[PDB]
Nucleic acid binder design. Structure first.
Ligand SMILES: [Mg+2]
Ligand SMILES: [Mg+2]
Ligand SMILES: [Mg+2]
Ligand SMILES: [Mg+2]
Ligand SMILES: [Mg+2]
Ligand SMILES: [Mg+2]
Ligand SMILES: [Mg+2]
Ligand SMILES: [Mg+2]
Ligand SMILES: [Mg+2]
Ligand SMILES: [Mg+2]
Ligand SMILES: [Mg+2]
Ligand SMILES: [Mg+2]
Ligand SMILES: [Mg+2]
Ligand SMILES: [Mg+2]
Ligand SMILES: [Mg+2]
Ligand SMILES: [Mg+2]
Ligand SMILES: [Mg+2]
Ligand SMILES: [Zn+2]
Ligand SMILES: [Zn+2]
Lengths: 129, 141, 82, 175, 149
RNA sequence: AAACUGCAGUUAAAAAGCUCGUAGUUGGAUCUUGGGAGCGGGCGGGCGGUCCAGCCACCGCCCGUCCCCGCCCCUUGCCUCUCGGCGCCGGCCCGAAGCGUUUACUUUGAAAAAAUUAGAGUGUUCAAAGCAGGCCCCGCCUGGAUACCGCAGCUAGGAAUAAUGGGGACCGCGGUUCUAGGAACUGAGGCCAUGAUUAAGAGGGACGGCCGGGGGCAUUCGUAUUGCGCCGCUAGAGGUGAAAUUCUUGGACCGGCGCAAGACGGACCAGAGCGAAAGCAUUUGCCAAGAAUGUUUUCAUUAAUCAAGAACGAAAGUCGGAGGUUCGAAGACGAUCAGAUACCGUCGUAGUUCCGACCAUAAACGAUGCCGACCGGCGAUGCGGCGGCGUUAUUCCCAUGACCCGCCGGGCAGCUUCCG
């Protein structure tokens, strides 16, 4: 059965990216998914998206720009201290000039560079470059 | 695929134990099955009695045949063939003498060396053959 | 493949798709007013009825359940509601 | 895929006494003390091959940082027009390598050759100047470079960078 | 797909987006409730009660009209079922198969089907004990099942 | 450990017949992020008043504020513990002085032997070492250092994530006052009920009309084969490469009529259908079960995978009964040409059939774990549903169909393909 709605959302965006699609439909929606998509949009990787309100868990239609190489999830959500952050960057991100790791911290959901500025750790959600 | 759950340490530990036992090097090292595998019974050298000189008794002047001797190891009674390093070191060795034997030929066999001989003579009467050849020591009787 | 707008499907596209596969789910069933023959009382009947519906006035059989839709008796008139 | 099939197809097809006496005899470079390159200096210019970039991605190795770990010195990777063209011909599947190659710290140098074959271009630059280090994982290219005196070779062994004919290696892996 | 059967199907109900009672419906919340009380005293399950109201009285959803579910309405009035409806029907089916199987020893297929039905009973009973609908000593027995339903 | 992750499982070593199923592992979305009412002050726009036209004079209304800033008020509750009651029959009611989430995670702070290690200073004549401040006829030069120290136990800041928590559109009784039957105050009982939202293109159940060589019990038909009785006719019949054992003038074989027994279910029969697999085919009746489809019915997470454990498992075979047509391992007879051309003929034991107990194996194949998501076109095909220009039959019962076209689901299979 389905156990990770964020994993399914990221995989479908990844596959639509490879096939040259301009729009992708992901269901079900989730506030974790919306927060993750917002982080990707601020760095210019996806673009604007729409949340469709049915009375059962929602759907999202996402516009695609063609700039995405790889988006993925990390399972299980490992606990990441600030001292461990550099090791995770080298394992998941090919370059130090682009790509981000998305964390869920007690101050909110942010990218790993923002987490270092706020001096906070948390749990790892995924990555994109 | 294998389990990638957060609470799966016990399952992962059992897999690594099984993988260790499939390693033939790990089993042999921990069970001690091959401690006595080598012809010297786990030692680096051995002592033997010089039986007779096969190369000299035959009249071939090859000088690769001539430096082969037969010795019997004291520890287990096996009979082996060893090399004398140089022709003229045969003169220092007599029959029924006690010699020290080391291994030879793990790297390989040179041109002009007989394949299948894996031993060499190093000492006679606890004196190195090179010292006797160079005239630095005398053989005690 | 053909280029479709996922955000703006046409009316012909959504009425053709399966009811669970639309952007927002919607049933294909409806309620109707049926007028009994012999006495002209009006009865509200579900389109995909699973029970035999009797006229309240005279207990006349108005419909009989089938696999997909209830078949109506001869001589009655019906109107969709809403 | 047929990208694989076309590649293997391409590699298969890849394999009087009065007159003045005139002859071209190139001079031995003054930079070399026999087999030792003295003018090779702590700022190292390294010519990067296209397959070196891809295998650095597979081994999770940053280009500039891993070269500095090997040499303990400032290193300047260099990209030719021939090498940049081959990355572009690979397609969207290799877009990550293309972005890495266009890095402002990298040295972008032009070349006016006939053809795109980058093994020939890199050998020619090695013959001309003797100031570069060649970073590649290609075996037959390494055989050609070994015939040219005074030019070190950088390669990947285990999950680290390694150097071949350089006396000032310092922080280089042991066996 | 199905928990035991290999097939997977998509046939189900699709509720409308709009949750409001239509204007043409002339029944009140109180009028619907007395209809529910009348049919329950006739010996009808909550699933069957909702079917009757939809087909004849034009009540598409009792929950939208009264604000409460049918089982919740019956429980408040005091007409609660002794056993949950889905569990009750499963026990009834197991009794029918076991009665058939005692007269037909050679029906291997019926013996196989009986095992599947009892597995669903165990799964359903375990869930109901955790929710404290059933006492934490209730057990399903073949001889006891006949008296249970 | 020299050259958070081992490499693989169609054909190269290998995924084990099938389903259920325990421990372990992993689990959809949302909420727990309060409500009110009036007076002020700023800010903008306009009008008017008083004084004798006003920066150099005071007052007062009105409209608005992307929208600021004050000032007050409601936030329900519960009886597990404790402290109480001047309350009712050990039980109950009540006020509380009682309770009204916890943890994981992350970032701190304490407390935690030296030596070793990292690291700062210092001409042992250098180095390996060693050492642990100096100056002045208070005062200066500097800081003779410092860092680390798993988990668990203490400590306190944090919004996310994940666990955990989250009344009757009823009944009978009293008491006190004010009035010509009325009203207003008030006091204790009895039953039932006690719950965060939604309704997953998650799952279970119910309901409706269908559908299928799916299963079990009984019933029934059809030729054929074998045996028997009678009739007609008269020398051969059988079998093979060729023959020979065998049967026949007391009539074989062949033709006709009738009777009995045991098996079997052709053609229609399809790459169609059903079942977890092994497997499943004459008519009719009965018993229980099931997939898919239809649904504006119901429950509300009840789920996935699974060592242990359990049910089933072609053919052959073993044990005990009942039968025995056909075929037939074994065995006995008759022959044994061609030939790398290579296993016949007659009789036929056990078996093949049925009812019970075992046995648990197949090239028991896609030589290919399961669940979920994503990822091209084109037509047919089986079942169910919806819409339809027209043909074709028609309905006491039985029944509302046959063909053609478009669409939607889940199946059995195909033709073509991009990337991988
Ligand atoms: Mg090349
Ligand atoms: Mg259904
Ligand atoms: Mg969740
Ligand atoms: Mg804390
Ligand atoms: Mg549903
Ligand atoms: Mg049927
Ligand atoms: Mg059937
Ligand atoms: Mg006769
Ligand atoms: Mg006859
Ligand atoms: Mg037939
Ligand atoms: Mg059998
Ligand atoms: Mg048998
Ligand atoms: Mg028998
Ligand atoms: Mg088979
Ligand atoms: Mg298999
Ligand atoms: Mg079918
Ligand atoms: Mg059809
Ligand atoms: Zn009527
Ligand atoms: Zn070039």
């Amino acid at each position: 059965v389905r156990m990770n709605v964020l994993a399914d959302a990221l995989k479908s965006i990844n596959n639509a990216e490879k096939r040259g699609k301009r729009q992708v439909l992901i269901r079900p929606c989730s506030k974790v998914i919306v927060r993750f998509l917002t982080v990707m949009m601020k760095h210019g990787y996806i673009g604007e998206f729409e949340i469709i309100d049915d009375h059962r868990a929602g759907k999202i239609v996402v516009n695609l720009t063609g700039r995405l190489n790889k988006c993925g999830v990390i399972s299980p959500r490992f606990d990441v201290q600030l001292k461990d952050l550099e090791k995770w960057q080298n394992n998941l991100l090919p370059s130090r000039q682009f790509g981000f790791i998305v964390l869920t911290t007690s101050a909110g959901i942010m990218d790993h560079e923002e987490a270092r500025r706020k001096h906070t750790g948390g749990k790892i959600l995924g990555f994109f470059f | 695929g294998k389990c990638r759950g957060l609470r799966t340490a016990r399952k992962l530990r059992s897999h690594r134990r099984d993988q260790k036992w499939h390693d033939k090097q790990y089993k042999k090292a921990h069970l001690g099955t091959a401690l006595k595998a080598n012809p010297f019974g786990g030692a680096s050298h051995a002592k033997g009695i010089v039986l007779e000189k096969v190369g000299v008794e035959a009249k071939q002047p090859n000088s690769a045949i001539r430096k082969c001797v037969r010795v019997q190891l004291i520890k287990n009674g096996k009979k082996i063939t060893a090399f004398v390093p140089n022709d003229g070191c045969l003169n220092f060795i007599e029959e029924n003498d006690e010699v020290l034997v080391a291994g030879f030929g793990r790297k390989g066999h040179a041109v002009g060396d007989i394949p299948g001989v894996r031993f060499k003579v190093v000492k006679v009467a606890n004196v190195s053959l090179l010292a006797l050849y160079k005239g630095k020591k005398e053989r005690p009787r | 493949p053909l280029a479709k707008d996922l955000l703006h499907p046409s009316p012909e596209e959504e009425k053709r798709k399966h009811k669970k596969k639309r952007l927002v789910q919607s049933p294909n069933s409806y309620f109707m007013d049926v007028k009994c023959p012999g006495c002209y009382k009006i009865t509200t009947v579900f389109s995909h009825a699973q029970t035999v519906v009797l006229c309240v006035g005279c207990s006349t059989v108005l419909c009989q359940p089938t696999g997909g839709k209830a078949r109506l008796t001869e001589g009655c008139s019906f109107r969709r509601k809403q | 895929g047929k990208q694989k099939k076309t590649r293997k197809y391409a590699t298969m097809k890849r394999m009087d006494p009065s007159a003045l006496k005139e002859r071209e005899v190139p001079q031995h470079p003054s930079c070399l003390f026999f087999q030792y390159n003295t003018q090779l200096g702590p700022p190292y210019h390294i010519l990067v091959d296209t397959n070196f970039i891809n295998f650095s991605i597979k081994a999770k190795l940053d280009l500039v940082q891993s070269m500095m770990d090997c040499l303990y010195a400032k290193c300047i990777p260099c990209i030719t027009d021939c090498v940049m063209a081959e990355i572009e011909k690979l397609g969207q599947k290799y877009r990550v390598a293309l972005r890495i190659a266009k890095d402002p710290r990298f040295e972008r140098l032009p070349c006016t050759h006939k053809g795109t074959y980058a093994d020939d271009c890199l050998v020619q630059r090695v013959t001309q100047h003797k100031c570069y280090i060649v970073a590649t994982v290609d075996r037959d290219l390494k055989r050609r470079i070994r015939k040219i005196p005074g030019v070190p070779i950088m390669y990947i062994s285990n999950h680290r960078y390694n150097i071949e004919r350089m006396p000032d290696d310092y922080g280089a892996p042991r066996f | 797909g199905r928990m035991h059967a290999p097939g997977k199907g998509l046939s189900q109900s699709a509720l409308p987006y709009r949750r409001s009672v239509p204007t043409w419906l002339k029944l009140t919340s109180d009028d619907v409730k007395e209809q529910i009380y009348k049919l329950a005293k006739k010996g009808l399950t909550p699933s069957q009660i909702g079917v009757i109201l939809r087909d004849s009285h034009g009540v598409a959803q009792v929950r939208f009209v009264t604000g409460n579910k049918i089982l919740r309405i019956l429980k408040s009035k005091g007409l609660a079922p002794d056993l949950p409806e889905d569990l009750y029907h499963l026990i009834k089916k197991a009794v029918a198969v076991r009665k058939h199987l005692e007269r037909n020893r050679k029906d291997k297929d019926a013996k196989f089907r009986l095992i599947l039905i009892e597995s669903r009973i165990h799964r359903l009973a375990r869930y109901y004990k955790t929710k404290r609908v059933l006492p934490p000593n209730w057990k399903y027995e073949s001889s006891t099942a006949s008296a249970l339903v």
